[PDB]
RNA sequence: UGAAACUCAAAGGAAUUGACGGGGGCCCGCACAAGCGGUGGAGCAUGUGGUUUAAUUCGAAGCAACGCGAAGAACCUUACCAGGCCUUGACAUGCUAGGGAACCCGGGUGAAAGCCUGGGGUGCCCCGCGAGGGGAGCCCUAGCACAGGUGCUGCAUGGCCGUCGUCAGCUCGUGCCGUGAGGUGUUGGGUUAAGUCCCGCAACGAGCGCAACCCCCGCCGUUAGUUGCCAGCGGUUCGGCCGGGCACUCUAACGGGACUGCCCGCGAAAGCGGGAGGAAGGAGGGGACGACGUCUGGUCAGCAUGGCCCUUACGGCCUGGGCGACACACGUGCUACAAUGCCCACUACAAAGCGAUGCCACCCGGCAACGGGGAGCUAAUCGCAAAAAGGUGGGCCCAGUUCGGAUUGGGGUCUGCAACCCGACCCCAUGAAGCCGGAAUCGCUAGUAAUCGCGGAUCAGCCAUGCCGCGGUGAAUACG
């Protein structure tokens with residue numbers, strides 16, 4: 020639900036956090 | 038051979054000097 | 061991580077070793093030519109415009 | 121290895137933390153991020169919590185682990201195999 | 204995507220640099236930065252005048268910027284008083300005595316950079332993109348040009364499916380070096396995204 | 410003889426442009442064949458899959474992804490993870506309010522960042538014998554507008570690139586043919602590397618392409634003659650070193666020179682075979698140059714950019730970690746398995762480049778990496794520099810070896826704040842697999858392949874065996 024790939028299950032958003 | 042650091046051949050390859058190839 | 065790294069490379073660092081080039085045109089960290097202060101892309105862009113003194117597409 | 125013409129490296133902020141402890145009758149548990157620091161004979165018998173990037177691994181210090189950096193005793197990859 | 208930039212292809216044969224100076228390895232770049240910085244100022248400020256070519260000349264601690272603007276009255280101002288406001292503001296970043304000439308444009312419909320900017324303008328102004336191509340190429344040929352070509356790319360009309368539209372008259376020998384081909388580019392911003400405008404004028408061979 | 414329920418938004422005819430064919434004809438490309446060296450096996454270098462991991466940031470995917478973005482990941486880079494921190498913020502403009510600062514020296518704490526902090530002293534135009542209050546470069550505390558985002562969509566985009574393919578092709582204007590799509594021209598005979606050119610023709614022209622103009626190499630001229638050159642005489646510590654000289658070599662600008670120009674032969678012509686002069690001959694070798702288009706090809710992570718999304722956090726600083734993991738699998742490579750070889754000493758011959766916190770002569774210390782001294786060079790002058798295979802001479806004697814140099818122990822050097830993860834190099838010791846590689850498979854038609862070394866970009870250093878160049882030596886074979 021955060022920045023880039025892979026996806027965290029929310030649309031558009033990924034697992035990487037800042 | 039060129040992989041042999043302990044020869045005048047291997048120092049010519051790795052471009053280094055030493056006992057086995059001085060200058 | 062773009063603009064705050066454009067700035068950071070300018071700042072004089074806590075240590076000599078932490079210095080690094082950036083393209084002064086686009087900000088690129090990689091493929092930065094010392095002579096121009098430019099990455100290999102901006103180099104090819106400004107060249108083809110003739111905005112680069114004396115630079116000319118080589119051939120031989 | 122580090123040119124012995126130069127020093128023997130300790131960040132100087134971890135060393136201070138030790139000498140103090142030596143003075144007042146140590147030992148507190150020492151945490152630090154200086155994996156690059158060398159194990160120095162003053163350290164022997166302390167336990168230094170070394171950072172592995174995630175946690176402070178506690179490390180006991182004996183006479184035979186003295187030539188080394190502290191990072192040698194707190195590995196950073198947790199592997200446990202394939203299968 | 205294949206084709207070579209027709210000006211970078213003719214440098215030394217039909218085309219002269221926008222910067223003339225020798226400088227040594229030790230300070231070339233620092234001159235280049237000012238050079239790029241200078242043009243930024245003037246393309247930023249003198250766009251309204253119809254900027255076409257910023258020639259930058261250097262000898263030593265005195266630099267000789269030369270603008271090529273379509274309507275030079277928009278540059279000079281109240282009798283040298285706009286030119287002044289920038290003949291000064293140039294030294295404000297230059298540090299050197301920034302001698303600033305303004306040069307007439309022989310015929311704007313023979314300056315590819317301008318044709319571009321004007322078509323780019325029209326498509327930024329919601330005109331029929333196909334029409335503007337066939338019109339610009341008409342105006343250029345009327346002006347005795349020996350061939351002219353214009354190229355638009357992006358979301359023409361805001362059509363979701365991007366496209367490429369062009370039109371060409373006369374002849375444009377891109378593979379010929381002795382052909383004098385003024386080539387300019389303009390960039391067209393809109394509410395739906397960006398479009399690229401390319402203008403090729405055959406001025407004739409040498 | 411001959412239905413219906415039910416179900417579909419088509420089922421069809423001819424003809425058009427394409428694409429395709431284990432249809433035809435005519436051509437071509439290291440396409441096969443003919444050859445020469447390799448890959449596939451080994452060990453290692455690097456990229457990738459997969460898996461693992463707190464993270465192993467993200468992208469590239471048959472040819473055309475895989476030493477690709479990466480022309481330099483220890484920190485930086487860095488976009489990832491853990492932890493400690495900042496909230497108009499690292500940066501932009503602009504509005505206030507309170508200090509009223511500007512900027513250079515400190516200090517307590519802490520891993521640093523940060524939090525708390527302690528010094529001095531600002532013009533600007535001013536009323537100045539005055540208290541001095543303003544205003545203003547530019548700093549700071551709070552408050553706003555706003556900054557910030559390598560978060561997503563390359564199936565919304567510009568730009569740039571890949572690719573078919575340097576393949577010979579793609580079209581248009583008018584005329585003509587057809588109800589029309591479309592056709593003609595561009596087809597046909599001959600020719601060429603080529604829609605190159607000739608001849609023919611309901612077509613006649615024209616544009617994008619091909620060629621040409623540009624660059625390097627090959628011969629000659631002019632112009633120059635130092636830092637380059639030394640033919641011939643004068644010196645000489647015998648070094649073009651000094652006298653001199655610019656002939657030559659070269660260097661770097663401007664020209665000449667090849668056009669099927671000439672002779673023979675074929676031909677309607679274009680051209681084609683052969684000959685002569687000639688340094689060079691049929692485009693002299695090489696490069697730069699890439700048609701209309703194709704692939705919803707690649708890039709939102711260089712940049713630009715519409716829309717979507719985050720706002721004490723999907724932003725920003727810091728320390729450490731990771732990008733270097735490893736049951737495995739593939740790719741591109743390096744080094745080899747040896748005697749046409751390996752080793753030691755001695756001695757020859759390049760080209761292109763780089764070089765003022767740079768190249769380092771030379772001198773001493775050290776087995777050495779290096780260190781210390783120390784001249785010259787803003788470099789046709791001084792240096793990197795020795796080229797290496799070669800040639801001469803000695804040693805090895807067919808052995809897992811004096812072949813191979815992986816792995817590991819120990820001891821050093823240097824760059825760097827710092828080499829545990831995770832640097833290069835040096836010396837002692839160690840001395841693995843490998844005996845020419847299964848099915849399979851790649852490159853090259855000549856100064857090419859193979860083999861030899863040299864340089865540069867990036868760059869403190871370097872994981873470069875990679876990449877882009879440079880010259881040395883120099884083959885085999887093409888019937889078709």
Ligand SMILES: [Mg+2]
Pocket residue numbers: none
């Ligand atoms: Mg993954």
Ligand SMILES: [Mg+2]
Pocket residue numbers: 026027028
């Ligand atoms: Mg999930």
Ligand SMILES: [Mg+2]
Pocket residue numbers: 037
């Ligand atoms: Mg961040």
Ligand SMILES: [Mg+2]
Pocket residue numbers: 077078079080485
């Ligand atoms: Mg760096």
Ligand SMILES: [Mg+2]
Pocket residue numbers: 080081082089090091092
């Ligand atoms: Mg860089």
Ligand SMILES: [Mg+2]
Pocket residue numbers: none
């Ligand atoms: Mg809207």
Ligand SMILES: [Mg+2]
Pocket residue numbers: none
């Ligand atoms: Mg049919």
Ligand SMILES: [Mg+2]
Pocket residue numbers: none
């Ligand atoms: Mg074959």
Ligand SMILES: [Mg+2]
Pocket residue numbers: 448846
């Ligand atoms: Mg093999």
Ligand SMILES: [Mg+2]
Pocket residue numbers: none
């Ligand atoms: Mg292998």
Ligand SMILES: [Mg+2]
Pocket residue numbers: none
């Ligand atoms: Mg993976």
Ligand SMILES: [Mg+2]
Pocket residue numbers: none
């Ligand atoms: Mg990956």
Ligand SMILES: [Mg+2]
Pocket residue numbers: 468
């Ligand atoms: Mg992405």
Ligand SMILES: [Mg+2]
Pocket residue numbers: 481
């Ligand atoms: Mg690298």
Ligand SMILES: [Mg+2]
Pocket residue numbers: none
């Ligand atoms: Mg960090």
Ligand SMILES: [Mg+2]
Pocket residue numbers: 487
């Ligand atoms: Mg990092």
